[PDB]
Amino acid sequence: GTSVTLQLDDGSGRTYQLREGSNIIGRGQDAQFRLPDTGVSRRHLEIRWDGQVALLADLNSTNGTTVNNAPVQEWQLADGDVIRLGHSEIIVRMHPLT
Numbered sequence: 729g730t731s732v733t734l735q736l737d738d739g740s741g742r743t744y745q746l747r748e749g750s751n752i753i754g755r756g757q758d759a760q761f762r763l764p765d766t767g768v769s770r771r772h773l774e775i776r777w778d779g780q781v782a783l784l785a786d787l788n789s790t791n792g793t794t795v796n797n798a799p800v801q802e803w804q805l806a807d808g809d810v811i812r813l814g815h816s817e818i819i820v821r822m823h824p825l826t
Contacts, residue, residue: 729779729824729825729826730779730780730822730823730824730825731745731746731822731823731824731825732745732746732775732777732782732805732820732821732822732823733745733746733820733821733823734746734753734761734775734811734818734819734820735818735819735821736763736816736817736818737810737817737818737819738816738817744760744761746775746777746782747760747777748777748778748779749776749777750774750775750776751774751775751776751777752771752772752773752774752787753768753772753773753774753775753813753818754768754769754770754771754772754773754787755768755769755770755772756770756771758770758771759771759772763813763814763816765813765814765815765816766814767791767813767814767815767816768789768791768813768814768816769787769789769790769791771787772786772787772789772793772813772814773785773786773787773789773793773811773813774787775805781804782804782805782820783802783803783804783805784800784802784803784804784805784811785801785802785803786800786801786802789813791813791814792813793811793812793813794811794812794813795809795810795811795812796809796810797810797812805820806820806822807820807821807822808820808821
C-alpha cells in the first residue's frame with residue numbers, strides 16, 4: 729500500500745495526508761486541507777485517492793492550478809510534484825505503508 733502527503737512549502741511545514749475518496753483543498757471551512765490564502769478559491773481543487781493513484785482536479789477555481797508549473801484541469805500526481813495555487817506551494821510525496 730501507498731500513502732500520499734501534501735506539505736505546504738511556506739515555512740510552516742504543515743502537512744496533510746490523503747484519505748481514500750475526495751480530498752478538497754481550498755480556503756473554505758469545508759476543505760480537508762484549508763489554506764489561508766486569498767488567491768485560493770473556497771473549494772479550489774480536489775485530489776481523489778484510491779490507495780494507489782492520486783488524481784488532481786481543479787474545481788473551476790478563479791485563479792487556476794498548476795503542477796510543476798504546468799496549467800492543469802486534471803492531473804495524475806507523482807512523487808515530487810509541486811502544486812501551485814494562489815500564493816501557495818504544495819509538495820506531493822508518496823511513501824509505502826506498513
